[PDB]
Design a protein around this ligand. Sequence first.
Ligand SMILES: [Zn+2]
Ligand SMILES: [Zn+2]
Ligand SMILES: [Zn+2]
Ligand SMILES: [Zn+2]
Length: 109
Amino acid sequence: HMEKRPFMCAYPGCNKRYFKLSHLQRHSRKHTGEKPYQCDFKDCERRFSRSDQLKRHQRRHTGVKPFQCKTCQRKFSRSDHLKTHTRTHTGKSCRWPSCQLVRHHNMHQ
DNA sequence: GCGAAATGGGAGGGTT
DNA sequence: TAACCCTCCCATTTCGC
Ligand SMILES: [Zn+2]
Ligand SMILES: [Zn+2]
Ligand SMILES: [Zn+2]
Ligand SMILES: [Zn+2]
């Protein structure tokens, strides 16, 4: 785990440093305040500085949930949302809250 | 209402 | 170069009861 960040931001007063030039060029859009990637869903009008941020956001509109829990078959749109959910099973036949297995799990969604 | 859990966004990291 | 996906932090919202 190295800390050498050779790419420094040239913005006046900014001390940001990054390991890769792509990370620095991605940071430079924060000073310009430009957010060109706008969500065109109804009654949203949200916008982001990065295209991947817009695609992550638009999954809440499209209902795309590629990540599925191997224990209770619950689906999530993000990998970190799935990993956090799996902690509910570590502490605690039906693995859904308040219910007494694949058919039952699939019917919950 | 309470705590837990889910949700959503920023920021940064890697892989092509 | 940058699209693309992952990982962590954080505040807010929703759920379970
Ligand atoms: Zn900067
Ligand atoms: Zn939207
Ligand atoms: Zn689960
Ligand atoms: Zn059940």
